[PDB]
Each structure stands twice: as structure tokens, then as C-alpha cells.
Amino acid sequence: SAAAALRDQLTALLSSMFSQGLVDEQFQQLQMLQDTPGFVSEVVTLFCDDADRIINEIATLLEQPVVNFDKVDAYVHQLKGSSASVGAQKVKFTCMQFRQFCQDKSRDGCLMALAVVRNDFYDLRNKFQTMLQLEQQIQA
């Protein structure tokens, strides 16, 4: 048919996420929660936005003549919390490495550190956007 073809794709896309380690049981819990039919799409839409906003705020802190590593550690810990809650486990564990740099007051470990956060955020944003598209076409 058409729709049936979409759920197979959406189920296929979703099975992608976990088979590649991009998401964990917390993402599973969101699915549990939805079971509010568009709940998951909105949560991911929000994470998508508040997530890049924090990356930008950290990039701004790391571009200052004097770096407030106190604040970088705080933004990383907030990003670590948004990640556990939607299930992007890697962004979350990379966030668990930043402290080490902030505490080491290193402007390169934090600057390259954010590059790995970038590495992990966009891989999942990719799988995020596609899912959103399929979830919308359920009723196009």
C-alpha cells in the first residue's frame, strides 16, 4: 500500500537508531510515554533545538579572551541531562569527558571536545529529522 509502507520505513528507521548505538532505553521510555500521539516528535523537535543552542552557548564561552570553564562545565552538564532523557547516549557520555577538560582549564580539550559533541549531535539529528518526516506523513 502506502501508509503500511511508511510504518515499515518508520519502524525500519527507528530500528536503525538502536542498531547503530545512537540511542538507548531512555528513547525506548519516550516511546513508552507516548503510549499524546505526537509526543515523541515534539520531544525530539525540542531536544533538537535546545541542544544546538547549548552547543552554541558553549562555543561562545570558548571564544572569550578569558574562558569561564565554570559555565562551560554547567552547559555541558545540562546538555548531558537533555541527552540521557531523549536517549542520545553518546552525546551524553562525551559530555562526561568535558569536566576533565574544564577542570584542566584547557581551551583545546574543550574546543575539540565540543567537536566530538558536534560529531554525535549531527549523526542523531540526521536519524531524528528522517523520523520526524515519516511521523508527519502518517497523515499527509
Side-chain angles (χ1 to χ4, degrees), residues 90-91 94 97 111-122:
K90 300 170 76 183
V91 167
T94 307
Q97 180 148 44
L111 267 168
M112 277 188 83
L114 198 62
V116 179
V117 167
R118 294 205 195 92
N119 287 349
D120 310 309
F121 172 66
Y122 290 102

Side-chain angles (χ1 to χ4, degrees), residues 2 12 45 47 50 58 68 71 85 105 113-114 124 129 134 140:
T45 302
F47 173 66
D50 172 286
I58 293 164
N68 177 353
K71 190 158 186 171
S85 294
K105 232 152 295 332
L114 198 62
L124 174 51
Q129 292 296 303
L134 295 164

Side-chain angles (χ1 to χ4, degrees), residues 5-6 8 11 43-44 49 51 56-57 74 83 85 111 114 119 139:
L6 292 165
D8 269 4
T11 285
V43 166
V44 163
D49 297 351
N56 311 317
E57 283 279 46
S83 303
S85 294
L111 267 168
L114 198 62
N119 287 349
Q139 281 295 308

Side-chain angles (χ1 to χ4, degrees), residues 51-101:
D52 155 72
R53 180 188 61 95
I54 297 166
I55 288 160
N56 311 317
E57 283 279 46
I58 293 164
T60 293
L61 296 167
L62 296 175
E63 285 163 20
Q64 307 298 303
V66 177
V67 176
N68 177 353
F69 290 85
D70 302 283
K71 190 158 186 171
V72 176
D73 204 352
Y75 276 110
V76 166
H77 174 272
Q78 183 200 318
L79 178 64
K80 192 199 60 77
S82 58
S83 303
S85 294
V86 299
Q89 67 189 339
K90 300 170 76 183
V91 167
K92 177 191 72 207
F93 295 122
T94 307
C95 285
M96 285 161 75
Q97 180 148 44
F98 245 113
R99 307 200 75 276
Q100 192 60 66
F101 290 140

Side-chain angles (χ1 to χ4, degrees), residues 20-53:
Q20 297 181 327
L22 290 187
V23 295
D24 69 12
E25 47 108 346
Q26 305 301 322
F27 180 75
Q28 155 266 69
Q29 299 180 184
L30 285 187
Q31 298 167 320
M32 317 253 124
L33 263 28
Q34 188 167 98
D35 284 316
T36 211
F39 174 68
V40 173
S41 297
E42 290 304 3
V43 166
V44 163
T45 302
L46 166 40
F47 173 66
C48 206
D49 297 351
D50 172 286
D52 155 72
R53 180 188 61 95

